[PDB]
Design a protein around this ligand. Sequence first.
Ligand code: MET
Length: 247
Amino acid sequence: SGKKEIVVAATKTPHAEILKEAEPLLKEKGYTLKVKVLSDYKMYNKALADKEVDANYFQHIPYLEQEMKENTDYKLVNAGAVHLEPFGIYSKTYKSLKDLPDGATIILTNNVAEQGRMLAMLENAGLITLDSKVETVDATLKDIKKNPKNLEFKKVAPELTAKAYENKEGDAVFINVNYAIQNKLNPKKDAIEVESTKNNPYANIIAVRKGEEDSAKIKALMEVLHSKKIKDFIEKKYDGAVLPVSE
Ligand code: MET
């Protein structure tokens, strides 16, 4: 019974909503589901490593890799990809990145793993150039080669960038789709720039403890999260802000 229950820590939206949609499909396979939502991204891998949950559903592989680099006690594994959230830039004050003035302030999130993801959007917009000798996924602010608009950067918790946006604390603000939707923003209608879906390594995953990735429970969960019902749910409910991907 408890051996048939899957406890998962997930961010509120879309991840806990996708799990709630998957619940009756898991019962059809013989498994129950318990979902825990936590207050910030740093809590989810800790809960898993502490054995309070069986799995978490909140991050991408670069985030997971960074977390394990920082905490050698985390012996975690990717059980499989589910969905992609193309990253957004938001502004109350400018309509596009081409319109930002010299000295403009860019509010980055403080997510170490996503520093290259953010900067790559600015490089693709033609605002900065990054050192070509560094992989984009590994790029930081130290890797900026050219900055002809002399952009200045600030860092806010990913949980609070929706507030930096509403407060007009900078000229342009990065918000992860999960926290954008959690704040009642619609990323495809409200963002001023959206990340390309091409060549994108930031699919969100199910993570488990090492040695648990082929367990019956986790295979059952991966199965439901790749069903036609769950892919169609994702596609309809989030209006293209969230996209199902292969495992
Ligand atoms: C904790 S890594 C960020 C995850 C977030 N759901 C995104 O894909 O942008």
